[model samples]
Target chain A: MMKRVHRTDVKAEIVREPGAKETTHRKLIDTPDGADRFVLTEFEVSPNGSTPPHFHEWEHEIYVLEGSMGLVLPDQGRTEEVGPGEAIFIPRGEPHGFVTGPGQTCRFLVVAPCERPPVRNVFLSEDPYEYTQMPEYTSLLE
Target chain B: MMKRVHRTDVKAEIVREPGAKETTHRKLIDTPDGADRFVLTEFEVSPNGSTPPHFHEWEHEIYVLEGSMGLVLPDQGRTEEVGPGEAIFIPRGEPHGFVTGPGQTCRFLVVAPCERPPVRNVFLSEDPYEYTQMPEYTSLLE
Candidate 1:
């Protein structure tokens, strides 16, 4: 089966991480639609907004769709600016964040594992895997 | 570990299929970079180009980044035109294809499972999961 959805059709929910600001997320595609291994989501980071630095157990494959954003590496104390047509792969346990420029809003898509390790693969369960907010590690708050 | 790559840095390979035409693909991220569960790749379909109708064992989660294209569902005898900011989820075994409009080039990112089922999950191996181009169905050559 296939599901074709427009970004406008999905509801955007504000990200609630401790330091997240002016960011909204939408689950574009997930397990319920028969996507077993990965879930597709879109995030819109408003100008000067961010999703603070943190690490999770699952890796992330992201594609920038609009504007540009800084990939904040709190542990390394550095930020890499990425723009549309750019791609990012953050492995499990890698701490990272997203912050947009003062004048440009960033819209991007993230593809992450639906089943994290230790839990194994659950068969198209009613409860799909959700990202757990990581503890805020103080640093690189720029 | 995290790897941030630009589309311009990767080489695009022409898709080789029985009826594929004017389509190129690039692997943005995969197992080599510790993306255990999924691989991120991009495809550029020039105006009037297409990757003919076919099906595979792995599902596809796609995001349209530029221009517009048609999601050809040969089995269902229909094609759905999708444009930028659109997301599509084609589950395993679903016959599908992509064709661009006559005046625009379509660029999109597809995230698919790294380890297809039955093979089970292999670690970060040298051989990453590659999409096996399926046989062309008799219908929907457009």
Candidate 2:
């Protein structure tokens, strides 16, 4: 048993978040489809759009397929410009976010474990949540 | 820890197989990079190229990013043309393969479990291997 379909055939839902702007979310593959270990999703951010600076218990493996995305770490005040063909790994519980430039929309694929706890956002003025880093993360980030 | 890099920066190795033609494989994200559960790979097949008809213990989740790919089930004598923006799921132990048409090359992303048994091929004239289908697969295929 298998499934195959054009992305357009899948419904695209607007991500509803106060800090998220012009972001469209689509689940390309997930648990319902018998994907036991991981889920694959596509996120499209229009020019000047962004996803909130949030962190969760699960990490994210990303691939940029179209345009450019500014990978943002709100707390660190760090942003990296990632263009098409770039593969990114964001560690578990690591506070990260994304933004698109004024010229082009950014579309990327994100893979994460299907079973993960709810996400927590990072607010500049609010008390921060504690996070535990996996031992291998330090070396991997380097 | 996190990692990010352009696909071109990663080494692209030619997949060597008697039946595989014009296939280039790149590990976009994998074990050495801290991907514990899954591995993401990119495959580029030149025009008229094809991957051998083989099945593995783990399933495959694919996304066609460029050109068109013919999803081939050699044993069934079935092949479906899939183009860009399409997502394909190949069930575990399913004998499946791919081919690119004459005009354009095919480039796609494949996500699979980090730990999987070796793959086996289905030779039309030879004996076939026994495969046990996952319980959820039947409904999933529909």
Candidate 3:
């Protein structure tokens, strides 16, 4: 049966990925098994934490719901700031990563068209915190 | 240059399709030339009006923002009532339509993965108001 979801009722689960503090995510909707797919998740990132630097083979879009988050686009040599009510469109194959700012947790919705679960598990190095401390890297905003 | 969009500043524009009034939509985001592939629009239906029956060839999802709306699924032989905060997911090639109920406008956001310009046009066979009888459709819930 096709499932109908209410945003308020969706279950929120905490996820621990390498390099980032514990994060909470609610999977609002996803393609049923064996279907050409997409997933929509509401993510809450802890202050000063981030996901590993990675790119998707499929497109992903983000809608910032609360607090401030940072995006680092190494290839473009730029770092951008996004806050509540803002929308970010990341095309397929764009090398990017994000981190929540100091003093406040960041929450955003991520919509992905494909169920590429491995994308989140790709570790740039054996250690996740290595990139977080590197401020000298060229960012997309440069 | 890439463009950034903010949802709070999103203004709604009436999107008319040929045969439906209860189901007409107001566009919030569009796929401009040299821009991304997604489009976002808000559907606003007054009591007794409805979006005409149609299908998009791409993925479409709707987030109900206000009031209540009725969805008639001819393929399923069912009409379901949806309220604010709920979301509906319609995969490619599915037949779907909506009707608005009394007292308030049913507003919802429609997000499409690919540009869906053709979905804006409605195909009405006769004068919709005369066929459905605006006052009668408005009183269906009573």
Where model 1 places Cα greater than 4 Å from the true spot, the runs are: A116-142, B116-142
Writing each residue's lDDT as its tens digit, candidate 2 over A1-142 gives 6888778888889976556777898898878887888878898999877666788888799999888878876555567888899999887888887777577688899988888888887653232212113222222222
A best-first ranking of the candidates according to their DockQ comes to 1, 2, 3
Over B8-109, each residue of candidate 1 has an lDDT whose tens digit, in order, gives 998999875545677999989978888776899898999877764556778888988888887878667667888988889888778777777579799888
Shift of residue B35 alpha carbon in model 1, Å: 1.7
Q: What is the lDDT of residue B142 in candidate 1?
A: 38
Provide the fnat value for model 3, as a fraction from 0 to 1. Answer: 0.33
Per-prediction DockQ comes to 0.65, 0.62, 0.37
Tens-place lDDT digits, model 1, residues A1-142:
5798889999999975554678999999988888777899899999877664567778888888888888888667767888988888887777777777679798888887777553222112233222112223223434
- DockQ class, candidate 1: medium
Among all windows of ten consecutive residues in candidate 2 chain B, which has the lowest summed lDDT? B125-134
User: Per-residue CA lDDT of candidate 2, range B67-108, in tens?
Assistant: 887777755656778889998878788888777757868889
**TM-scores across all candidates?**
0.80, 0.83, 0.72
Between candidates 1 and 2, name the one with more favorable DockQ.
1
Candidate 2 segments exceeding 4 Å error: A16-18, A101-103, A124-142, B16-18, B124-142
Model 3 achieves a DockQ score of: 0.37
* Error in Å for residue A2 of model 2: 1.4
Per-residue lDDT of candidate 3, residues A86-134 (tens digit): 6676766777777665686887777666546455432355666766555
Winner by lDDT between candidate 3 and candidate 1: 1
Name the best candidate (by TM-score). 2
